[PDB]
Structure formats: structure tokens, C-alpha cells
RNA sequence: UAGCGGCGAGCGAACGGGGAGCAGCCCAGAGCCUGAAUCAGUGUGUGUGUUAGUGGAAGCGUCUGGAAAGGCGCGCGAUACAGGGUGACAGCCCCGUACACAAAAAUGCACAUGCUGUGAGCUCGAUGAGUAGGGCGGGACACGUGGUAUCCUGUCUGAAUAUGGGGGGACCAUCCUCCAAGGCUAAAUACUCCUGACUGACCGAUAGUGAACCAGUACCGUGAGGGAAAGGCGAAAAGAACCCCGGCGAGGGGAGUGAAAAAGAACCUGAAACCGUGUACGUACAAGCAGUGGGAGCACGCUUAGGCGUGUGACUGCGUACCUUUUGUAUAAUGGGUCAGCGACUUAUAUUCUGUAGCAAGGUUAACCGAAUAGGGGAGCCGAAGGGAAACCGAGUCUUAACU
RNA sequence: GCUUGACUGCGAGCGUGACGGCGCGAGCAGGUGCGAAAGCAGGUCAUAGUGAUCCGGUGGUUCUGAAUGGAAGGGCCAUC
């Protein structure tokens, strides 16, 4: 029972050469190079799934900082004031109000100002 | 237990330990796969690196040429070289214990009775050794794929069933585990039941 | 029961150990052999009893005894084997005909193993003290 | 083919009732004046092969 | 296993048992005898094969299709539904197959049968001499000189000869058994250059023979010798009449054949590396394993005219390949130019242990017989009893004069 | 001063060792030596003073003894 490898090796090489679409040079048309590119892209995607949640909280904090300082309070005092006032709105929403509802944010900064004072 | 006879409407008594025991799928399977293994001819062979035609001259010197070292034109790595683990003619037959082969048949016969696939007749033959005869005989009995077990090998019945693909005519001593399962229905003459009664004991 | 519906018992057809067929199989690369030893070579491995050059156990211990040719032609007979004979005579010849002792055994001894429940006569076979009591307790008799 | 017994081991080990092996004690062949009688007396009876060395003996005696 | 063994590596019987197959004889010589059996050659038959061959059943309509053997419907043969071909898959189209027949000539085998040649029986005998044995040196015996029997002999010797001699594993006595120094002998056994038939959980063009092909060829070597690559149009050549550009070229565009020419002979399918043409997007102030997370803009498909999908990816955070070997590699340590095909834990036997199955103090046969994957075959193997070096004893035994 | 316990054959139980092994050991027999006897003596205050296995040598032996009786050889015990 001799087994020929032509059909299944063709499909296994095509399987990851399709995953290497858009890569530069041999990384998108040469199997040996494309396998390393596909594996490395898998390692990067796994770790950037976990540091996408950091890069976005950094963005939210920086925007809450910028908006709070326009209302006369820093980020650190703003968050501390919100905890004292028992406001559970998180950074994703706080940074959303800061951009799309300027009146609500300043009505929300005054909530933290009263809690601290 | 007893088996009803379609031909004569009488009854025939048989041992419960032969035609009435539980099905042993694990045991029946081993005997069946060991029957198919004994049908293998097992005649085949490839050439090792010692049997490929060619000389033992080293293709190129050990060092200095810049090529990967080689020692034989017949290395299995090379094309037109030897096969690494080239096969030999081998015997694939397995040993089946006597108490298992008989034990497997008893489970097969018992399961045929439970599935209404074993039918017993008083006698089964054809007047002339003509294939058209038992072809008509089996239409009357409403049988298409059938194995006929006869007490004595009937020459007319053997010749008249030879050209029918879905019909097999044996004798009570020519019963095998595979053919009992491989056929839709099994027809045993009352003489044949007695012989397998005293063969399977 | 069809030829394509009968299957083996659960756990009776353990699959073989395929060695060196990728990372995921757990047996790829070295194939259970480790790295860079004599035991990892094709055909490598030390013989039986070799201990690295230290005098092996089967050579630093002394030989003892001799093989007795009389024990090769002497057998032992159990009480449960006395009923296997035909005719109620447990002699040296009636005991080979029952396939109890080898065809070339010349001395047999009946020991207390099993039990005697029928009267038998034992000619020419040595009988232990325990077996003599049991043979005579079943109505049998022992003859020199 | 049949495994070959290590004939040297078959002359030094005998298998007992429960699968162990008995062997003759070493140090009792010569140089015996300088050995105390207590040392030689304890060295006369046969001993059993230890747990560590059973693997090396079962290998050498496949038909034990 | 017993043994042999720097008692190491290893080597490794026989007795006995079960089977296949069985077959016995005549020259050491004379009497009658009588051409007597068994035999070799040759002819004559009588059969049976081999070397050519002969007959050999039974199907039509309709649908798709280039084409029917396919679908559907209704029939028939079958001791023939093995196989192959035919425009797709045929029991009934063809060749065959089952079966039944056939030899002028040559020839194998088996009987009968004459002729030629040797010889059957009874009595009386006789009983293989430089031989057996020995010394020295070697070799074969499972046996390596060992306490070493036995066999062979290169060299020196050397009997008895049936009232005798050999062997029974140093050797002696007794006993048992056999008769060397002369020969012949079928079957069971081994193999396949070659012939025929059939088969394959064997390969299918880098495989299988080195060789599917004009292969032991081309080619290499002084030579012995080494030794390739290379298969497929189509059902049928119907292998492209004719016209046009071109050098009365190569090559191509039409025409035509064909189901199909993107089946056009560099011819089934036609992958990947590699190289181009076209389109969309990005790209000439910008630094690095070239990706990944975020992300505008642009183009495009929308079928709720709805946001999404697809292509690209300005900018931006993070980010020094893979394998191997290592304490540790981006390492400037190894390996890899890329693609495609091939390439490495197998097989046989034995032993031990797990899972599973059958029987169970029993289990199981091997060879072989049997057409029998049946059935027979229990020769044997393992287990139910161990202790001791052993005799021996025995649920005990060894140790010791004896053990609490 | 007298002596030979520098005994014979076993040893519950322990310590060390991967193992081979190497230690310590009270107690049981059998026979002793010292002491009036309670006792203690199985070498030396202790820890080095050593060499496995194979192969053979010597003495003993209720073992074995290749047809049988012996024997050779082997085994076991002591020892080189
Ligand atoms: Mg194939
Ligand atoms: Mg591409
Ligand atoms: Mg050479
Ligand atoms: Mg090849
Ligand atoms: Mg059988
Ligand atoms: Mg692992
Ligand atoms: Mg390695
Ligand atoms: Mg190493
Ligand atoms: Mg290792
Ligand atoms: Mg090798
Ligand atoms: Mg050394
Ligand atoms: Mg027997
Ligand atoms: Mg000694
Ligand atoms: Mg025989
Ligand atoms: Mg014809
Ligand atoms: Mg015809
Ligand atoms: Mg049409
Ligand atoms: Mg049709
Ligand atoms: Mg076609
Ligand atoms: Mg001679
Ligand atoms: Mg001699
Ligand atoms: Mg010797
Ligand atoms: Mg002799
Ligand atoms: Mg002689
Ligand atoms: Mg003679
Ligand atoms: Mg002769
Ligand atoms: Mg001859
Ligand atoms: Mg080839
Ligand atoms: Mg091809
Ligand atoms: Mg030339
Ligand atoms: Mg043209
Ligand atoms: Mg010109
Ligand atoms: Mg032209
Ligand atoms: Mg046309
Ligand atoms: Mg095409
Ligand atoms: Mg085609
Ligand atoms: Mg083509
Ligand atoms: Mg392409
Ligand atoms: Mg621009
Ligand atoms: Mg600048
Ligand atoms: Mg720019
Ligand atoms: Mg740059
Ligand atoms: Mg920079
Ligand atoms: Mg993204
Ligand atoms: Mg970076
Ligand atoms: Mg490497
Ligand atoms: Mg280093
Ligand atoms: Mg690093
Ligand atoms: Mg370097
Ligand atoms: Mg490097
Ligand atoms: Mg390199
Ligand atoms: Mg490579
Ligand atoms: Mg291996
Ligand atoms: Mg079980
Ligand atoms: Mg103890
Ligand atoms: Mg006194
Ligand atoms: Mg002192
Ligand atoms: Mg001192
Ligand atoms: Mg030595
Ligand atoms: Mg020696
Ligand atoms: Mg004796
Ligand atoms: Mg004798
Ligand atoms: Mg003798
Ligand atoms: Mg002696």
C-alpha cells in the first residue's frame, strides 16, 4: 500500500500560502518563508490581543485627562472624585462622553469636584 | 429451542447452546477479521539498498567536493535507490483458538435465528442441473441473496447455482464465519442443521 | 450482524506508537530517544548485564551447584491426578498413558496436592507421608 | 529466534518460589585465614538478589 | 535444555517422542540347477497426454449525449455473470468463458507383449591388514585438551582375525549390542536460466527490473567496469484543403475537421517556484525580521439603499526569522537559493508486561493428514509445589548434633 | 597466676551502602577457660593493615557417578 503525498501536501502548502496574502516578497509566495511569516503573525496577533486592551485604556485615560483639564481638574483627581461620588462609569464611556457630549462631561466633572470638596 | 420448517410446516429441535445464545460481537469480530487475514496472499517485495542493481563505489570522496557526503548510489535517500524498509512476502494468517471459531459460529448462528435470516427446509434441490431452474425456485421462496447449506454436496444444485452471483451452495462442513454474515438469508436443509449441530457440538 | 456493522471490543485495538511524525504527536524530532547518546543511535545500546565496565553482577558472584541428571527423569504426581488414570492402578506405566508424567520419567512421587476421592492402588511410586494418609483414607492401598 | 540465556548467569542464579533469585555470597573463595569466622559464617547461606539488581538478572535469564 | 566457553562475547547438542516417505540387495566362490525373479536395450500393440485446432447460448424500444455499454421499459441465456475490446459502465455487439469434440506426423508416460544381454534358487563355504589400535602434530565432533570418549590422518609404528573384534563419553570388571578395513540403491529433500495457466489489502513512470520507450543502449573509462534520461493527441488522422503576413523561412491569423484545437503533433489533466501584460490602491523627507493592534483616505459590490463586505494601507504602539546545538543564540555558531516529487523507528522470531476475547485447574496445539481458514493430530509447551548444590524430602524443606 | 572464647552453628534486631558487600549485636544450643560466684571470654582501647569472579591445588564428605559395580570428574564444607 504505497501512499503518494502529492495531493495532501499541495493542500497543506496552499492552506498557509492563503494565510500569507499581502505579505512582501517571498513571504507571500514561498512556502518556507511564508510558514515563518504565518507563524510569527500568529504570535503577534495573540500578544496584541492582550495589549490592544492596554493601548486603548491608555488612549481613554489621555482623553479623559485632556477633557478634565479643560474643566479645571487633572485626571488623577477626576477619577478619585468619581470614586468618592460612587460613579462607576468606566474609561471607555468617560472618554466617549468627553468627545461627543461636552456638556455632560462638565456636568460630570462637577460631580467629582463636589465629592472632593 | 425449535426451528420451524417452511417446506414441510413441521418443527425441528436444536440445542439452545448453539442456535440460542447471546451475540458476542467482540468474539465474532476477531474471528471474522482473522478469516479475512487468512485470505491474504501476502506476495510482494521491494528492494533494499542491498538488492538494488548498482555497485558499491562511493560516488565522490568523503571531503573536499562541497557536496553532502554520500557512500552508495543505492542509498534510500537517493532516487532510484533502495527502499528503507523494503517489504518481504509475509504470512498474515492469525491463529484462532478452536473454542473461539466454534464459539464465534454459535454466536453467528444464534444471531441469524434472532434476525429471521436463517430458514430451515426439509430438502432443497433441483430436478435438472439448469441455472434457470433454481433461479425460478428462489423466486417462489422470495430469495435474492441466499446461502444454501446442504447436508451432502448436490452436484445439480452446485452447477445450477454457479452462475448466480447472489447464490452460494455449500455443504455443512464448508461453513465459514464470513459467508454466514455476508449473505442476506441462509437456507439450511434439515440434514445440514443436524450436521452443524454435531459439528459445533 | 452485517459485515460492516461488527466492531472490536472497546480498548482491545490500541493504536501503534508512530515515532517521529511532527511536533504535535509528542513523539516527533528525537522520537523518545533524547539527545546525543549511545542509546539514541541506530542499533545503539549496551548488551544484557553490561554495567559500564564495572564487573557485572553475573560475574562478581560465584557459581554454585551442579545439575543432577536424576532430577530430569523424576517427576511429582498430585492426588488430583490419580483419578485421571484408567483402571484404578497408579503405576509408572499407567501414569504415562494418562499423560500425567513424561514418557522418559523413571521415578515418580505422589505428593499431597489436591485430594483423592477414589480407591486406587499405587505400585512402585514413592508416596509422601501426607499423600499416604490421604490415599489410605479413600480406601486405596500403596504397594512397594 | 529464541533469546539466548546468559549462560554465566544461569550458573549463579536460581529462581525461587515467588519469582526472586537466590545467589551465592561473594568473598568466600580464598583469603580466608584473615577473615573472622563470624564474617564467613554469615557468608555461607544463599542470599536473594536485591531490588536494584532484579532488572539486570531477569534480562540475563529470559527462561528462568 | 545438558554442556562447551579469556566459563567472557558467545557457541550449543543428543537420548527420546510426533510426522512425510519407506526397500532392499550383491562381490569378496564351488557344486547341482537352469535360463527361473528382478532388471537394461529394442520392436509390436492398447490407452492417456504434449506439439495446430472445431462448435460454443441469449436484446430490443425510448431519453440525454459527439458516441450508449448509462437512465427508463419490457424480454431471453446461464454447467457460459472468468476476462478483454468495442465512440461513457455490455451476461445477450465481437473475441472468449462453461461444456462437448479433434491429430496426418512426431513425441512423453502407463500396461501387455515378443527378441537381445546379465542372471533366479538349495547346500557347502568364506567373511575386506599396513587395516583396527598406539606415539607425535593437527582437524571434525555443540565439546576451545579439559578427567575427554568417538571420527579423519601428515609422520613413525602396528594386531586378533568369530575360541575373534568394535561400542556403550577417561579407565577397569560384568552385562548388553553390533560386525569396520568392498560396493549399489527409489521416495520423502534443495533450486528455477527456461515453458504454460492463474493469483495478489504488490508498484503505477523520481514508483516497479538499471531498462513500460530500439537499455545494459547513449555516454564515461586503456581496461576490468560504471551506466542514464526518456510513456499518454484524438473514438477515429478526420494530423489542418485553401487564403494572408513572412526569406518559396521560423512563426502566426483566418478557413476547415473534430464533442472539444485553450486536444495541433514542444499535443490528456497542466500545480508550484520563476517571468510578464492590464486594472485599483499605496509609494520620491524616509531608517531596521517587513508583521501585528489601531487607523484615515481612495476604488469598488451591494441584493433593506443599508451599513457592511472586498482591494489597498498614509500615520501610529509593539516587535532582532526558522532549525539544530547549547548554561545560554538576532547572534557575526550550524543548515537551508526557491519550488515540485521522493527521504528516516520497519520486518521476522523469542521473552516479559498492559488492554481485550475465549476457555478455566486447566489452557493450547506444532509438524503433518485433510480440497477443506473446517475437522483430525495433545508429540509437546505453560500452570496447578516448593526446599536443597545434590541424593532426597514434600506444604514443607534446607541449615545444623538440634534448633524455641 | 591459670589458661586458649584468636571456640563450633545459628542469630531477634540494627546501622551503613546503587549493588556486590561491610559493620554492631543481646540471645539460644554443643563443648570450654578463668573466678569462691555475681559473672565474662565468639581476639587486641576503636577507627587503616587490603583484592571480586574465573581457573586450578590440598584435606574431609550420609551428595552425584552417562548400561550396571567402581572409578575419573563434578558438588558441598575447610583452606591455598
Ligand atoms: Mg496506488
Ligand atoms: Mg501568488
Ligand atoms: Mg573497494
Ligand atoms: Mg527502485
Ligand atoms: Mg486446526
Ligand atoms: Mg515531549
Ligand atoms: Mg540531534
Ligand atoms: Mg550528552
Ligand atoms: Mg541519552
Ligand atoms: Mg547502522
Ligand atoms: Mg576496568
Ligand atoms: Mg505427553
Ligand atoms: Mg572453596
Ligand atoms: Mg521417527
Ligand atoms: Mg471457434
Ligand atoms: Mg459465442
Ligand atoms: Mg440526441
Ligand atoms: Mg441501453
Ligand atoms: Mg470519455
Ligand atoms: Mg588410527
Ligand atoms: Mg586414543
Ligand atoms: Mg573442562
Ligand atoms: Mg571405549
Ligand atoms: Mg574404532
Ligand atoms: Mg568385516
Ligand atoms: Mg557395510
Ligand atoms: Mg553411494
Ligand atoms: Mg524508472
Ligand atoms: Mg503522468
Ligand atoms: Mg570507448
Ligand atoms: Mg494553419
Ligand atoms: Mg532566402
Ligand atoms: Mg506554416
Ligand atoms: Mg465544427
Ligand atoms: Mg482546457
Ligand atoms: Mg482521455
Ligand atoms: Mg496539454
Ligand atoms: Mg502557474
Ligand atoms: Mg503623495
Ligand atoms: Mg527634514
Ligand atoms: Mg511624502
Ligand atoms: Mg531603508
Ligand atoms: Mg531612527
Ligand atoms: Mg486592524
Ligand atoms: Mg519598535
Ligand atoms: Mg541546523
Ligand atoms: Mg558554548
Ligand atoms: Mg535574545
Ligand atoms: Mg564558523
Ligand atoms: Mg547564523
Ligand atoms: Mg549556508
Ligand atoms: Mg533541501
Ligand atoms: Mg528499536
Ligand atoms: Mg481474561
Ligand atoms: Mg531477620
Ligand atoms: Mg571452677
Ligand atoms: Mg593490648
Ligand atoms: Mg589500636
Ligand atoms: Mg579472567
Ligand atoms: Mg582458562
Ligand atoms: Mg552410587
Ligand atoms: Mg557407571
Ligand atoms: Mg560408561
Ligand atoms: Mg570424588
JSON list of C-alpha atoms (C1' of nucleotides) in Angstrom, two decimals, chain E residues 187-318:
[
{"chain": "E", "resi": 187, "resn": "A", "atom": "C1'", "xyz": [10.60, -41.92, -2.23]},
{"chain": "E", "resi": 188, "resn": "A", "atom": "C1'", "xyz": [10.05, -38.18, 1.10]},
{"chain": "E", "resi": 189, "resn": "U", "atom": "C1'", "xyz": [14.52, -33.14, 0.44]},
{"chain": "E", "resi": 190, "resn": "A", "atom": "C1'", "xyz": [17.03, -28.30, -2.27]},
{"chain": "E", "resi": 191, "resn": "C", "atom": "C1'", "xyz": [16.72, -24.81, -6.57]},
{"chain": "E", "resi": 192, "resn": "U", "atom": "C1'", "xyz": [14.48, -22.15, -11.16]},
{"chain": "E", "resi": 193, "resn": "C", "atom": "C1'", "xyz": [18.26, -19.96, -16.76]},
{"chain": "E", "resi": 194, "resn": "C", "atom": "C1'", "xyz": [13.53, -21.62, -19.00]},
{"chain": "E", "resi": 195, "resn": "U", "atom": "C1'", "xyz": [7.75, -23.04, -20.68]},
{"chain": "E", "resi": 196, "resn": "G", "atom": "C1'", "xyz": [2.09, -22.62, -19.66]},
{"chain": "E", "resi": 197, "resn": "A", "atom": "C1'", "xyz": [-2.02, -21.16, -16.76]},
{"chain": "E", "resi": 198, "resn": "C", "atom": "C1'", "xyz": [-3.72, -18.48, -12.65]},
{"chain": "E", "resi": 199, "resn": "U", "atom": "C1'", "xyz": [-3.33, -15.10, -8.32]},
{"chain": "E", "resi": 200, "resn": "G", "atom": "C1'", "xyz": [-2.10, -10.54, -5.40]},
{"chain": "E", "resi": 201, "resn": "A", "atom": "C1'", "xyz": [-5.30, -5.40, 1.08]},
{"chain": "E", "resi": 202, "resn": "C", "atom": "C1'", "xyz": [2.31, -5.59, -4.74]},
{"chain": "E", "resi": 203, "resn": "C", "atom": "C1'", "xyz": [4.19, -0.69, -7.96]},
{"chain": "E", "resi": 204, "resn": "G", "atom": "C1'", "xyz": [1.85, 2.69, -11.45]},
{"chain": "E", "resi": 205, "resn": "A", "atom": "C1'", "xyz": [6.59, 6.38, -15.00]},
{"chain": "E", "resi": 206, "resn": "U", "atom": "C1'", "xyz": [11.63, 10.29, -9.28]},
{"chain": "E", "resi": 207, "resn": "A", "atom": "C1'", "xyz": [7.37, 4.17, -8.17]},
{"chain": "E", "resi": 208, "resn": "G", "atom": "C1'", "xyz": [8.02, -1.12, -10.24]},
{"chain": "E", "resi": 209, "resn": "U", "atom": "C1'", "xyz": [13.58, -4.51, -13.03]},
{"chain": "E", "resi": 210, "resn": "G", "atom": "C1'", "xyz": [19.13, -0.38, -14.32]},
{"chain": "E", "resi": 211, "resn": "A", "atom": "C1'", "xyz": [15.64, -0.77, -18.64]},
{"chain": "E", "resi": 212, "resn": "A", "atom": "C1'", "xyz": [6.98, 0.25, -19.71]},
{"chain": "E", "resi": 213, "resn": "C", "atom": "C1'", "xyz": [10.35, 3.96, -24.85]},
{"chain": "E", "resi": 214, "resn": "C", "atom": "C1'", "xyz": [15.23, 0.02, -30.34]},
{"chain": "E", "resi": 215, "resn": "A", "atom": "C1'", "xyz": [18.57, -0.29, -22.30]},
{"chain": "E", "resi": 216, "resn": "G", "atom": "C1'", "xyz": [22.98, -2.94, -20.44]},
{"chain": "E", "resi": 217, "resn": "U", "atom": "C1'", "xyz": [21.61, 1.42, -25.14]},
{"chain": "E", "resi": 218, "resn": "A", "atom": "C1'", "xyz": [23.68, 6.74, -25.29]},
{"chain": "E", "resi": 219, "resn": "C", "atom": "C1'", "xyz": [27.67, 8.25, -22.54]},
{"chain": "E", "resi": 220, "resn": "C", "atom": "C1'", "xyz": [32.18, 7.62, -19.17]},
{"chain": "E", "resi": 221, "resn": "G", "atom": "C1'", "xyz": [36.96, 4.56, -18.57]},
{"chain": "E", "resi": 222, "resn": "U", "atom": "C1'", "xyz": [43.19, 1.90, -21.55]},
{"chain": "E", "resi": 223, "resn": "G", "atom": "C1'", "xyz": [40.75, -1.83, -19.06]},
{"chain": "E", "resi": 224, "resn": "A", "atom": "C1'", "xyz": [38.09, -4.74, -15.58]},
{"chain": "E", "resi": 225, "resn": "G", "atom": "C1'", "xyz": [33.96, -1.91, -15.08]},
{"chain": "E", "resi": 226, "resn": "G", "atom": "C1'", "xyz": [30.18, 2.03, -14.31]},
{"chain": "E", "resi": 227, "resn": "G", "atom": "C1'", "xyz": [25.81, 3.42, -16.55]},
{"chain": "E", "resi": 228, "resn": "A", "atom": "C1'", "xyz": [21.39, 7.02, -17.58]},
{"chain": "E", "resi": 229, "resn": "A", "atom": "C1'", "xyz": [17.35, 10.39, -19.29]},
{"chain": "E", "resi": 230, "resn": "A", "atom": "C1'", "xyz": [13.20, 9.33, -21.90]},
{"chain": "E", "resi": 231, "resn": "G", "atom": "C1'", "xyz": [5.45, 6.79, -21.55]},
{"chain": "E", "resi": 232, "resn": "G", "atom": "C1'", "xyz": [-0.15, 9.29, -22.69]},
{"chain": "E", "resi": 233, "resn": "C", "atom": "C1'", "xyz": [-3.31, 13.96, -29.37]},
{"chain": "E", "resi": 234, "resn": "G", "atom": "C1'", "xyz": [-7.97, 12.02, -30.75]},
{"chain": "E", "resi": 235, "resn": "A", "atom": "C1'", "xyz": [-13.25, 7.40, -30.50]},
{"chain": "E", "resi": 236, "resn": "A", "atom": "C1'", "xyz": [-11.38, 7.53, -35.43]},
{"chain": "E", "resi": 237, "resn": "A", "atom": "C1'", "xyz": [-5.71, 11.16, -38.52]},
{"chain": "E", "resi": 238, "resn": "A", "atom": "C1'", "xyz": [-10.70, 13.07, -39.57]},
{"chain": "E", "resi": 239, "resn": "G", "atom": "C1'", "xyz": [-2.71, 15.03, -38.46]},
{"chain": "E", "resi": 240, "resn": "A", "atom": "C1'", "xyz": [-5.34, 21.25, -40.54]},
{"chain": "E", "resi": 241, "resn": "A", "atom": "C1'", "xyz": [-7.51, 21.53, -48.48]},
{"chain": "E", "resi": 242, "resn": "C", "atom": "C1'", "xyz": [-7.44, 26.81, -49.39]},
{"chain": "E", "resi": 243, "resn": "C", "atom": "C1'", "xyz": [-6.29, 32.23, -48.33]},
{"chain": "E", "resi": 244, "resn": "C", "atom": "C1'", "xyz": [-2.99, 36.08, -45.80]},
{"chain": "E", "resi": 245, "resn": "C", "atom": "C1'", "xyz": [1.86, 38.38, -43.37]},
{"chain": "E", "resi": 246, "resn": "G", "atom": "C1'", "xyz": [6.83, 36.37, -43.56]},
{"chain": "E", "resi": 247, "resn": "G", "atom": "C1'", "xyz": [13.04, 34.86, -46.51]},
{"chain": "E", "resi": 248, "resn": "C", "atom": "C1'", "xyz": [9.15, 29.82, -51.93]},
{"chain": "E", "resi": 249, "resn": "G", "atom": "C1'", "xyz": [11.65, 30.56, -43.86]},
{"chain": "E", "resi": 250, "resn": "A", "atom": "C1'", "xyz": [10.61, 30.07, -38.40]},
{"chain": "E", "resi": 251, "resn": "G", "atom": "C1'", "xyz": [6.22, 31.58, -36.52]},
{"chain": "E", "resi": 252, "resn": "G", "atom": "C1'", "xyz": [1.38, 33.12, -36.69]},
{"chain": "E", "resi": 253, "resn": "G", "atom": "C1'", "xyz": [-4.08, 34.88, -38.21]},
{"chain": "E", "resi": 254, "resn": "G", "atom": "C1'", "xyz": [-8.30, 33.11, -40.71]},
{"chain": "E", "resi": 255, "resn": "A", "atom": "C1'", "xyz": [-10.87, 28.66, -43.25]},
{"chain": "E", "resi": 256, "resn": "G", "atom": "C1'", "xyz": [-11.90, 23.61, -42.27]},
{"chain": "E", "resi": 257, "resn": "U", "atom": "C1'", "xyz": [-12.05, 18.59, -39.38]},
{"chain": "E", "resi": 258, "resn": "G", "atom": "C1'", "xyz": [-13.31, 17.29, -34.74]},
{"chain": "E", "resi": 259, "resn": "A", "atom": "C1'", "xyz": [-17.69, 16.70, -28.92]},
{"chain": "E", "resi": 260, "resn": "A", "atom": "C1'", "xyz": [-13.56, 19.60, -27.72]},
{"chain": "E", "resi": 261, "resn": "A", "atom": "C1'", "xyz": [-7.67, 22.68, -31.28]},
{"chain": "E", "resi": 262, "resn": "A", "atom": "C1'", "xyz": [-7.12, 26.82, -24.71]},
{"chain": "E", "resi": 263, "resn": "A", "atom": "C1'", "xyz": [-6.88, 18.03, -27.78]},
{"chain": "E", "resi": 264, "resn": "G", "atom": "C1'", "xyz": [-2.20, 20.99, -33.42]},
{"chain": "E", "resi": 265, "resn": "A", "atom": "C1'", "xyz": [1.68, 16.85, -33.06]},
{"chain": "E", "resi": 266, "resn": "A", "atom": "C1'", "xyz": [7.05, 21.03, -27.98]},
{"chain": "E", "resi": 267, "resn": "C", "atom": "C1'", "xyz": [-0.25, 17.54, -28.39]},
{"chain": "E", "resi": 268, "resn": "C", "atom": "C1'", "xyz": [-4.98, 14.11, -21.63]},
{"chain": "E", "resi": 269, "resn": "U", "atom": "C1'", "xyz": [-5.02, 16.76, -16.80]},
{"chain": "E", "resi": 270, "resn": "G", "atom": "C1'", "xyz": [-1.31, 21.29, -16.80]},
{"chain": "E", "resi": 271, "resn": "A", "atom": "C1'", "xyz": [0.07, 22.62, -9.81]},
{"chain": "E", "resi": 272, "resn": "A", "atom": "C1'", "xyz": [4.40, 25.47, -7.57]},
{"chain": "E", "resi": 273, "resn": "A", "atom": "C1'", "xyz": [8.76, 28.03, -7.94]},
{"chain": "E", "resi": 274, "resn": "C", "atom": "C1'", "xyz": [10.03, 31.73, -11.76]},
{"chain": "E", "resi": 275, "resn": "C", "atom": "C1'", "xyz": [8.69, 35.69, -15.62]},
{"chain": "E", "resi": 276, "resn": "G", "atom": "C1'", "xyz": [5.10, 39.20, -17.82]},
{"chain": "E", "resi": 277, "resn": "U", "atom": "C1'", "xyz": [0.63, 42.50, -19.61]},
{"chain": "E", "resi": 278, "resn": "G", "atom": "C1'", "xyz": [-3.83, 45.17, -17.58]},
{"chain": "E", "resi": 279, "resn": "U", "atom": "C1'", "xyz": [-6.64, 47.36, -13.58]},
{"chain": "E", "resi": 280, "resn": "A", "atom": "C1'", "xyz": [-7.41, 49.51, -8.09]},
{"chain": "E", "resi": 281, "resn": "C", "atom": "C1'", "xyz": [-4.81, 51.43, -4.16]},
{"chain": "E", "resi": 282, "resn": "G", "atom": "C1'", "xyz": [-0.12, 52.95, -1.76]},
{"chain": "E", "resi": 283, "resn": "U", "atom": "C1'", "xyz": [4.75, 54.80, -2.72]},
{"chain": "E", "resi": 284, "resn": "A", "atom": "C1'", "xyz": [10.34, 60.09, -4.33]},
{"chain": "E", "resi": 285, "resn": "C", "atom": "C1'", "xyz": [11.91, 63.97, 3.98]},
{"chain": "E", "resi": 286, "resn": "A", "atom": "C1'", "xyz": [12.14, 58.32, 4.63]},
{"chain": "E", "resi": 287, "resn": "A", "atom": "C1'", "xyz": [15.55, 54.40, 8.65]},
{"chain": "E", "resi": 288, "resn": "G", "atom": "C1'", "xyz": [15.86, 48.10, 10.84]},
{"chain": "E", "resi": 289, "resn": "C", "atom": "C1'", "xyz": [12.92, 40.07, 10.74]},
{"chain": "E", "resi": 290, "resn": "A", "atom": "C1'", "xyz": [8.67, 43.86, 6.80]},
{"chain": "E", "resi": 291, "resn": "G", "atom": "C1'", "xyz": [4.46, 41.56, 10.64]},
{"chain": "E", "resi": 292, "resn": "U", "atom": "C1'", "xyz": [0.62, 42.56, 14.26]},
{"chain": "E", "resi": 293, "resn": "G", "atom": "C1'", "xyz": [-3.10, 46.18, 17.31]},
{"chain": "E", "resi": 294, "resn": "G", "atom": "C1'", "xyz": [-5.32, 50.68, 15.98]},
{"chain": "E", "resi": 295, "resn": "G", "atom": "C1'", "xyz": [-6.40, 53.54, 11.52]},
{"chain": "E", "resi": 296, "resn": "A", "atom": "C1'", "xyz": [-7.78, 57.88, 7.81]},
{"chain": "E", "resi": 297, "resn": "G", "atom": "C1'", "xyz": [-8.22, 58.28, 2.76]},
{"chain": "E", "resi": 298, "resn": "C", "atom": "C1'", "xyz": [-9.21, 56.11, -2.08]},
{"chain": "E", "resi": 299, "resn": "A", "atom": "C1'", "xyz": [-11.52, 52.42, -5.53]},
{"chain": "E", "resi": 300, "resn": "C", "atom": "C1'", "xyz": [-15.17, 49.02, -5.88]},
{"chain": "E", "resi": 301, "resn": "G", "atom": "C1'", "xyz": [-20.10, 45.09, -4.86]},
{"chain": "E", "resi": 302, "resn": "C", "atom": "C1'", "xyz": [-24.30, 45.71, -2.78]},
{"chain": "E", "resi": 303, "resn": "U", "atom": "C1'", "xyz": [-29.34, 42.32, -3.46]},
{"chain": "E", "resi": 304, "resn": "U", "atom": "C1'", "xyz": [-33.02, 46.84, 3.23]},
{"chain": "E", "resi": 305, "resn": "A", "atom": "C1'", "xyz": [-30.20, 51.63, -0.49]},
{"chain": "E", "resi": 306, "resn": "G", "atom": "C1'", "xyz": [-28.39, 49.83, 4.34]},
{"chain": "E", "resi": 307, "resn": "G", "atom": "C1'", "xyz": [-24.24, 49.82, 6.66]},
{"chain": "E", "resi": 308, "resn": "C", "atom": "C1'", "xyz": [-21.45, 46.12, 5.81]},
{"chain": "E", "resi": 309, "resn": "G", "atom": "C1'", "xyz": [-18.19, 43.16, 2.53]},
{"chain": "E", "resi": 310, "resn": "U", "atom": "C1'", "xyz": [-13.62, 43.25, -0.79]},
{"chain": "E", "resi": 311, "resn": "G", "atom": "C1'", "xyz": [-8.74, 45.52, -2.52]},
{"chain": "E", "resi": 312, "resn": "U", "atom": "C1'", "xyz": [-5.13, 48.96, -0.83]},
{"chain": "E", "resi": 313, "resn": "G", "atom": "C1'", "xyz": [-2.85, 50.88, 3.60]},
{"chain": "E", "resi": 314, "resn": "A", "atom": "C1'", "xyz": [-0.87, 57.47, 4.89]},
{"chain": "E", "resi": 315, "resn": "C", "atom": "C1'", "xyz": [0.03, 57.57, 10.08]},
{"chain": "E", "resi": 316, "resn": "U", "atom": "C1'", "xyz": [0.78, 55.13, 14.74]},
{"chain": "E", "resi": 317, "resn": "G", "atom": "C1'", "xyz": [2.01, 51.41, 19.63]},
{"chain": "E", "resi": 318, "resn": "C", "atom": "C1'", "xyz": [4.70, 46.81, 19.95]}
]
